[PDB]
Symmetry: D2
Subunit: 257 residues, 4 copies
Amino acid sequence: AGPVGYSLPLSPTGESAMLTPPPWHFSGEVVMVDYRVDPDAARRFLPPGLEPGADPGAAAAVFATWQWCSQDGAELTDPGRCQFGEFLILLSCEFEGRPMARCPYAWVDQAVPMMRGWVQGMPKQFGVIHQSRPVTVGKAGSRLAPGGRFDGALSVHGRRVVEASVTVDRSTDQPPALHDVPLAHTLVFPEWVRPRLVASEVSDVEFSPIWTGSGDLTFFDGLGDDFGALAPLEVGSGHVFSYGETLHGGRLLSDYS
Amino acid sequence: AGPVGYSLPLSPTGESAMLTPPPWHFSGEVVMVDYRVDPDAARRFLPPGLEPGADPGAAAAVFATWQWCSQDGAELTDPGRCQFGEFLILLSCEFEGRPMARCPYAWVDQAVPMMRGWVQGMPKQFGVIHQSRPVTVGKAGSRLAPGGRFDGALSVHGRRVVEASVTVDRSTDQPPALHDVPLAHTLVFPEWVRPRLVASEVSDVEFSPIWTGSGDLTFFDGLGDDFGALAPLEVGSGHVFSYGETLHGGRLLSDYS
Amino acid sequence: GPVGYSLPLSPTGESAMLTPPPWHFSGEVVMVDYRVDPDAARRFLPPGLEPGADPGAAAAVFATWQWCSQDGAELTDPGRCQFGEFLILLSCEFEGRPMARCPYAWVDQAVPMMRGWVQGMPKQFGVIHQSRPVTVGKAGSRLAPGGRFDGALSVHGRRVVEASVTVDRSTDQPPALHDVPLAHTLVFPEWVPPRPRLVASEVSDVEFSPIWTGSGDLTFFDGLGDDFGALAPLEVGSGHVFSYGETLHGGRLLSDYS
Amino acid sequence: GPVGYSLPLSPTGESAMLTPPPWHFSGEVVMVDYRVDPDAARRFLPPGLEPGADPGAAAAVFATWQWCSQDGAELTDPGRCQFGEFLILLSCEFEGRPMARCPYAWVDQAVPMMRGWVQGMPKQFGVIHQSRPVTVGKAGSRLAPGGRFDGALSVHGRRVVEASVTVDRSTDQPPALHDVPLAHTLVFPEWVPPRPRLVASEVSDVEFSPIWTGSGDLTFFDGLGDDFGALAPLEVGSGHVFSYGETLHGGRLLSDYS
């Protein structure tokens, strides 16, 4: 009885909900830089149940642009509804001996993806996110080929947060490690009037060939010392590739009870 | 142990959270139109526990622009962080004989207010929201005085949803009824791996003198038949005024258990 | 005194909003050919521009671009070098030679908008969305038979145009209206109390990818006035999805009406 | 052929992005007076514009505006008639008479931006935020002693200027640089292979509210180049918060350098 829906707003038929129930399909383009983080700083961002990664200092800065849709594909016919840009930080960790990634910070530039992020425990905030695109004709850009350069930038509240650059020098069939492991999130929502460690369950994960080369990464101040603690000590390889996956729901790792 | 925060993202000191804990202060400018809704349609948007209003057909369309801050006032020094625009629909209802308002739909144009809305059970989505401002010098606008006209508009996904207009003809000290009663929301968040009816508890509610006159309201298609069921049968008086309140937290009306 | 290719002037010239040409462009296009009322089209042609050998041929063109100056500097800041665009093209001729007239265009960045007016190209501001091909996963279409691509323009929070293309084959035949000179009217409003010039944009190094062609669909909406509405499609033809590059060098005078 | 006050031309003239003047403006201003290096300021003055009786006087000006044409039509669509602005003013004189030079301005809507260039006003695009007075509740400042008001400009996702004013009294003395003619350089880039004109914006019905004045604070950031940076404050003076109206009619020629 009364109005219903997968999410707010509730409505008599359920059609009004901002979010659709999973599964959701994603197809995107990524510009990523591997980097070295202070392992002791990283540890502070891992909740109970998540241990330091096998390489505790391994981190990544990830820019992506996405199209997404529900099972029926309906969103694809309206490009404004199905596209968004994203930046995230990944930290290496483990759950019961199994490699995973912790995402301590993420930004996107559309509201549906942001809220859907919180549904999963992924800590998405809003930002302005730009990313180079490969070209195949003309001179105004870079090709996916040796010598090709690609850049990403994130600003929040009108100031810069991260800039990244990659100049690729070869193609491989080796997915970057932090982009090829489960993400372990903390599901929690502010009390108005019981956090859980969850993994996002995915299927049909697909990578294009990976273009790899030099990486560059600059973090800026503004977001606070907690975020700055994760700035790079050293910057590693950059990677440019296409990525797809289907996201089904959450798997409980720990109730803490 | 591990990272903490009022909300995501969690961080070692808690400083990174997107949201600050309540209370939050609001100061805004409102352009509102009273209207008559199909009472039977309205009833479908009321969850168990909420009965039809004493005047079941009374509704309102409300445009507002706001500044807000936490108790320490910190957000006020960065206008980009403390301002947002909003449009909402209000329906008249009652909880145990006491008049309240149900907000079945709301839109805002900033991410913090949107998420904070879901914390309260208020069904905020994202939109583009415009609203006339009174002027006191020159000719390019209307004064808060007899004959003054004020307009509001909401577009979502690049198409119009609502347009409203008010031409004021007198000032009163009578707050519009639907803007002077508690809001009863449904607190619910999508399951990833138990709705509650709550009232938002407010204090220090303050209205300027109310400028009242003719109202006009146009709803457009696009958002679905559920939303369209709430379009006006007849349009009543418009009101232009300033409003302040302090929002403290939620009060449980019903657990349904 | 201060100098610059454009405003703002500054002591070294570095502050100018616009850089001098040439400028390079690399874009992704979703285009639909259509039939326009020939009488309506004629009314948008200024003196010197005559009706096309096919007076009713028109096109609706969505594109996303990267651009840069000769030194390539803008490319390192994606926010500075990218923009989206929608434009209408009408078939015409000047002194016996086929050209295209752009009576309306919209973009979503200020530099391209002003640079348009420098050329006589009538760019206004809008919100412009366009599907992108995907190569992995399920959330999109491949550039392959059956792939669908959509475009939308809204202005002042209202729909103006929606277009869609479902491609069915690849060709090496660039769409006619996208492979002729554009003839613009270079004119600026008089601020201190005329003198329009008909000018063509001079381009080099024009390049097309293979052209994916199929069915086209186009819908115009009301709101922008009866003048724009007069160019609404009577019938909709083929759609095309392709990549495009050119270098834009400056203008050449077609007529100054002297 | 098609006509219009500005592009796009159309059969009836209705499609033009800009309407002819006069245009009315009603705005809310947060302004900070400051001291600029006089040598730096001189380098931004074109021929005919000479240093101010006080060469070092400058101002940083945040404003939010509504505007409309003579018929008032734009007022009914708030999205069409509103914009935000930040500008720098420098003190100067022309033929012995005090004026202001605006070497840099930013706005957040396309119509005002293009209309600026029509006048020779060097408007670019930016993100501009400004505090608003409140009259109820606790989330803001009143226009009263102790009230604080802030402004910020970011361009390409980087800070450019932050300003703040804490007012302590009301006066009937309009800020000097906001109460003189603006002398602009009307010039457009040559597209077909000069001829700048020094022009003043002709205004009438200038009106100020009472002026709330107090302490001023101003911070410039790097990023826009050494040319803009040269106008950074050496010292910051008084701040002012007030409402402003004017009607802008057209341009008058100061010099065409012939």
